[model samples]
Target: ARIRCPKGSKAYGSHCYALFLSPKSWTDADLACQKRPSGNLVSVLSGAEGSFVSSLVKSIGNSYSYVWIGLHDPTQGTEGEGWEWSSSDVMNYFAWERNPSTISSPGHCASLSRSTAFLRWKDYNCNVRLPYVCKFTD
Candidate 1:
């Protein structure tokens, strides 16, 4: 079977990447991704995949500061709680902009930064509104 991205999405690996430039809360962005065909917020599992998504954000530079990705602290940011991807993929590769152990929030949603740092991941309040990147395997 073919794994292809739908309209307005770019193909990479087994996923199709869609960079949505409009603002939405993390949960709202997640729901919007669900509205698309086989879509979900991106879950980066490898360095290459991370870079692929980052490059997409770079293409639309300066317009957004943080674009939400699928990773979130579902356990309400407990000390021992772990992060999980929206797609429930296993976490293998990660590049958190800050030390994960230093995060101090009841809940945290991950986003990719668009500053001179490129696409380093950062955690913010999930309710904050920002644009997002979405992906699907079709």
Candidate 2:
């Protein structure tokens, strides 16, 4: 999820990133991310970025709950499949939490969900309607 810094938000360099996805089905969420400038949200490469994105998501209050991201284990053939992580140009790394078991379904992606706690991630039906956030620097 490549996100642009919000208006008046802090930044380390001259640029920042934030991405917004309208409430849509799983397929629409992927489509929206693909149409963005970076192609998706900021792919977590290190612990720093992982913490930053998590903090940012939590800071959005309850209104900005659970934003969709680019990384998805799409089982369905419609929205593409496998780990599609990258910031438009294709990313080599992103933050992920492991699960003891896996679900046999499409839409393998991550979300901040209600809380960024241990086991916060759960395989969800991507076609479900939900908003998503992404970050970027520009």
Candidate 3:
């Protein structure tokens, strides 16, 4: 049988990923995904999965573009509470381009950078507008 996916979602490996062309704040993106059946902001579990998601975004080939993923820190630097995924998955791997610093500014949301070399994680303000990916399990 053909693997099933939500309408308008594309199948990648064992997951269905949908790209929203419009930009929205991290909170709005999460709310948008919640409106869809089997939808949630993409939760990257491994380097390979990250690469796959990166390639899909890179196909758009826009430099400096970023997509919101299912990662954030609600406590925003409370001791012992770092980044956490909306799906509640344990953060096993990370691909941060720079050392995540709390010294510069307040950043409570995590997004994937669509740079040429590879996809890197960047912490950003939750209020920023950016296109986001929604994932539906296949």
lDDT string, candidate 1, 1-138, tens digits: 466667798999877889887889998998999887667788888888888888888867666678899988877766434788888788888788885667555347888877634457887789998889898866
Best by lDDT: 1
Model 2, total clashes: 25
How big is the positional error of residue 33 in model 2, measured in Å on the Cα after superposition? Answer: 3.9
lDDT tens digits by residue: candidate 3, 56-79: 677655634778998888877663
lDDT of 2 at 61: 54
Q: Which run of 10 residues does model 1 get worst, by summed lDDT?
A: 99-108
- The segments of candidate 1 whose C-alpha lies over 4 angstroms from its true place after superposition are 1-3
Error of 2 at 108 (Å): 3.1
In terms of lDDT, model 2 sits at: 0.51
Clashing pairs in 3: none
TM-score of each: 0.89, 0.61, 0.84
Which regions of candidate 3 fall more than 4 Å away from where they truly are? 61-64, 101-103, 116-118
- Please give, for residues 11-125, the per-residue lDDT of candidate 2 as tens digits: 4333354545457655576565556444445455556655655665665555555666555554443433356554544545544444413443434566555655411444456
Arranged by lDDT, best first: 1, 3, 2
lDDT of 3: 0.78
Q: lDDT scores for all predictions?
A: 0.80, 0.51, 0.78
